[PDB]
RNA sequence: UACCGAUUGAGCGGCUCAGUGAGGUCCUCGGAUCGCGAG
RNA sequence: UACUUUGAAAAAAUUAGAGUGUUCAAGGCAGGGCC
RNA sequence: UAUCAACUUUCGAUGGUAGGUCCGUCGCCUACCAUGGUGACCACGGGUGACGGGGAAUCAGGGUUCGAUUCCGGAGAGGGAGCCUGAGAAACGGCUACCACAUCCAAGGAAGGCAGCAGGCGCGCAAAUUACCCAUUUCCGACACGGAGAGGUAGUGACGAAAAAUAACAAUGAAUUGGAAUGAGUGCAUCCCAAACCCAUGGGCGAGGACCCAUUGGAGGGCAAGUCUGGUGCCAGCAGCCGCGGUAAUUCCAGCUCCAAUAGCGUAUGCUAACGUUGCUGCAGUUAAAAAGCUCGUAGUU
RNA sequence: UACCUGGUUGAUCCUGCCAGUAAUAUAUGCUUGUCUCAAAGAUUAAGCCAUGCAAGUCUAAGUGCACACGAGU
């Protein structure tokens, strides 16, 4: 059980200290890894450019075709799949343009039926894709 | 390094359930019978008495005859019966935790021109607030949530250039004795 | 395949929108919001078709 | 109509002056501009308007009354010595000069690098 | 997606061994030059 | 000598809080009354 | 942070003595001796997207997180080092070197330091005018007089906080009618202010779809709100989660309607409460993750 | 305000997490009529800087034989 000596708050102190690192939430934030592994390395939003067009399928039991884009970022020049969240905006998307990807709802976890994607795009052409789907800022 | 004081503090707080049935019909029912904009003037009442029932809170936790108790205890009594949300005969810090959001409610400068007449109706009395009708002791005041305490109670009436009591006509009253 | 992005919202038939009044906006949407939900009464949702 | 008040006063004689709290009323009016106020404030004391001097008029919200400072000097001379250069040009009494704060300060860096009497021929 | 992997793998940083060591400061004396002294 | 209570001492700003109708309020540290 | 358990001490590490040096004390340094000093109560080494604190956010009580940031102290002016002047500097809007970078040149030479105020480039998800005045606040100087991008005033500004329009009042069965009511705006005076600007006070224009039009997300559940209509047919798309779309979709694309907050609101990533899922208050360990195979044994705790 | 809700099963009671909920930070999408107050190149780059400016300074009283002047300025 637990030490209740009224000298004992140096090993509380250490006890806790050393359990709060089992815990999958406080050892993710406070130390190197997850965050070196992180493409944004700790920011909200990040700019690339694309590379291809690609389609993931999505996940059992649904059935769909997944409009994505492989886009590389500027900063790192990493790699990664992010996502056209809405209906016919990858028609929007040019190869080779300025998009601004962000995270997709779960902290770096692939949200819905999508594979892998963890990522989705925010504006394109330095012009919201949102906006273009409103017909606003026709571009 | 600016002559500045950077001093900012919010005068309301959102509910922790955003859609509680329950809750968002007492409050609309205030809003309507107070004639009220949005649900922040409702929010903003109920921290208003919060501060109040906290302050109070933190008294009844100190014992009698304490030189502070006596002190601020006495200042928030003499403070509330000012304004008129507090009778006279019971100004105890025990019954500051018996007050309602409705107590305040209707102490607003919106709410007292029309019980004294002055207004048809609620939402009458705040359109002529906004548009310099109605004063208090010859000051023209233009804010509907001007909460009026028991010194400037019998001195709520038009303004002396309001048309409504003694003064020139609007624009357009004299528009249309200019043209027919 | 990505032959199909904007398939449902091109096949859609395109239907405006009508030109309707203007609607009370502050002190006067909570009013008639007020009036509607206590006052005039006399169950059923505020949009039930049924 | 308009009436000055003078609701509060002190003579202090060191700088030759009688402050004093203006507060004046016009409940129909517009704002009293202060040649108006300066010269009704004069013939109170028994005195000439160019010794008075008032300013800050902060009208209050609705309108009636307006609030603000004021001092009366014993002379003229006083007034030249003891009063700003800013509420003397007010009246007829100063001019500021004509040269920009930016044309001295480049102008005098421009003499930084000439040594001699040729300092000020290369400034003008 | 990480891991092992010959390639004395490669790149970019921190602190240091040794050598070389600019430039001040003091200490010894050195006297262009100026009127025994200042230099 | 730990504990406990008291006193001394302590940068302000900030926080709490007294007073005060910037038209109300956030605030300000001012301003009220008489001829 | 132990996947750092011994570290320091030739070349000062601990101490003693004499001296040197400094404004002065001291291994601060030198010379001769002594062999010490620190560590399981975590030394030493490493890491920090670490300047410390007054504070800030969120909190029933305890706590968790943040603090480059206007106040105090410290540190540094591209990187280190050395010195001059002076009461005060190891000063860089002082100087002398090397390193990096960079400017002019008759190619002999000369000169440079915006982590000052504006502004430019680069970097990025991310941050404003190459403006005005020394009038207020104070400082400096042979001085009541000069100077001050310190500071103050405007410009940019949905970082945020407070107040607060988008209608009110009456008959008639609604872009029906009816007269009233002040703002937004717009000029003109005054006020304001170093001149200006903003507010405020007046009077002259100023509303009937008072066309002077309120957006932003949702309407299966969680979670307030359509067995509506058309289109698509596991396609396109929705969905934080569970799910929806398989030709009669309350969930997709739209129309209508409705709901919520409102000059705001949605989203992404941190952070806090949720979380008694880090439990000191206050969690668990028979079978759901869990008591070392067992016993002895010092520090530690009691 | 000392608060919980969805999700393992044919159904149930649990451990448990994922998801929801509400503040606060910057960034961003869309949108904006008044008035007041106010942060604002900190995060990557103590990265590089064109140009202007940012520290100068007289009293009857340390010197003062040019200007312009009846000593003073």
Redesign the pocket.
Same mark, same amino acid.
């Given at each position: 059980?637990?030490?209740r000596?009224?000298?004992?708050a140096?090993?509380?102190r250490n006890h806790?200290?050393?359990?709060?690192?089992?815990?999958?939430?406080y050892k993710k934030?406070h130390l190197?890894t997850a965050?070196?592994?992180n493409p944004f *390395?700790?920011?909200?939003?990040?700019?690339g450019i694309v590379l291809e067009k690609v389609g993931v399928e999505?996940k059992q039991?649904?059935?769909?075709?997944?409009?994505c884009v492989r886009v590389q970022?500027?900063?790192n020049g990493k790699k990664i799949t992010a996502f056209v969240?809405? /209906?016919?905006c990858?028609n929007f998307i040019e190869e080779n343009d300025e998009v601004?990807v962000?995270?997709?709802?779960?902290? *770096?976890?692939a949200?819905? /039926?999508?594979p892998g994607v963890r990522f989705k795009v925010?504006?394109v052409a330095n012009?919201?894709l949102?906006?273009l789907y409103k017909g606003?800022?026709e571009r | 390094?600016?002559?500045?004081?950077?001093?900012?503090?919010?005068?309301?707080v959102?509910?922790?359930?955003?859609?509680e049935?329950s809750?968002?019909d007492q409050?609309?029912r205030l809003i309507g019978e107070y004639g009220l904009?949005?649900?922040?003037?409702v929010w903003?009442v109920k921290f208003t008495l919060?501060?109040i029932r906290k302050?109070a809170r933190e008294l009844l936790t100190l014992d009698e005859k304490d030189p502070k108790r006596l002190?601020?205890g006495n200042?928030?009594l003499?403070?509330l019966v000012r304004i008129g949300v507090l009778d006279e005969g019971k100004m105890k810090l025990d019954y500051i935790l018996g007050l309602k959001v409705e107590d305040f409610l209707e102490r607003r400068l919106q709410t007292q021109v029309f019980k004294l007449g002055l207004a048809?109706?609620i939402?009458?009395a705040?359109?002529?607030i906004?548009?310099?009708?109605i004063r208090?002791?010859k000051?023209?005041?233009?804010?509907?949530?001007?909460?009026?305490?028991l010194?400037?109670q019998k001195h709520i009436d038009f303004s002396l250039?309001?048309?409504y009591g003694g003064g020139?006509?609007?624009?357009?009253?004299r528009?249309?004795?200019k043209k027919a | 395949?990505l032959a199909?992005?904007?398939? !449902?919202?091109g096949? #859609?038939?395109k !239907?405006?929108?009508?030109?309707?009044?203007?609607?009370? #906006?502050?002190?006067?949407?909570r009013?008639i919001?007020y009036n509607r939900?206590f006052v005039n009464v006399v169950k059923k949702?505020?949009?039930?078709?049924? | 109509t308009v009436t000055v008040?003078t609701?509060?006063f002190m003579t202090n004689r060191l700088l030759q002056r009688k402050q004093m709290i203006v507060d004046v009323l016009?409940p129909?009016?517009?704002?009293?501009?202060?040649?108006e106020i300066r010269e009704k404030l004069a013939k109170m004391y028994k005195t000439t308007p160019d010794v008075v001097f008032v300013?800050?008029?902060?009208?209050?919200?609705?309108?009636g009354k307006?609030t603000?400072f004021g001092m009366i000097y014993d002379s003229l001379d006083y007034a030249k010595?003891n009063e700003?250069?800013?509420?003397l040009?007010?009246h007829g009494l100063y001019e500021?000069?004509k040269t920009?704060?930016?044309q001295?300060?480049?102008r005098?860096?421009?003499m930084?690098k000439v040594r001699g009497?040729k300092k000020a021929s290369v400034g003008a």
């Open positions: 059980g637990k030490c000596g009224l000298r004992t140096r090993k509380l806790r200290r050393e359990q709060k690192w089992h815990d999958k939430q934030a190197g965050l070196k592994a *390395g700790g920011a909200s939003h990040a700019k999505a039991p649904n059935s769909a075709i997944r409009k970022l500027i900063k969240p809405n /209906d016919g990858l601004l962000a995270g997709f709802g779960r902290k *770096g976890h949200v819905g /039926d999508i925010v504006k012009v919201s949102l906006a606003k800022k | 390094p600016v002559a500045k004081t950077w001093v900012c503090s919010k005068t309301y959102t509910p922790r359930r955003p859609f049935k809750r968002l409050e609309l904009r949005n649900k922040r003037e903003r919060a501060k302050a002190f601020e200042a928030l003499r403070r048809k109706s939402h009458h705040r359109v002529l906004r548009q310099r009708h208090v002791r000051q023209v005041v233009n804010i509907p949530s001007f909460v009026v305490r010194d400037s250039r309001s048309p020139r006509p609007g624009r357009v009253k528009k249309n004795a | 395949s199909r992005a904007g398939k !449902v919202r096949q #859609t038939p !239907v405006d929108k009508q030109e309707k009044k203007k609607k009370k #906006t502050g002190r006067a949407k009013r919001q939900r949702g505020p949009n039930a078709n049924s | 008040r609701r509060k016009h129909g009016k517009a704002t009293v501009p202060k040649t300013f800050g008029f902060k009208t209050q919200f609705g309108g307006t603000g010595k700003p250069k800013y509420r040009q007010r500021k000069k920009s704060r930016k001295r300060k480049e005098k860096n421009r930084k009497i």
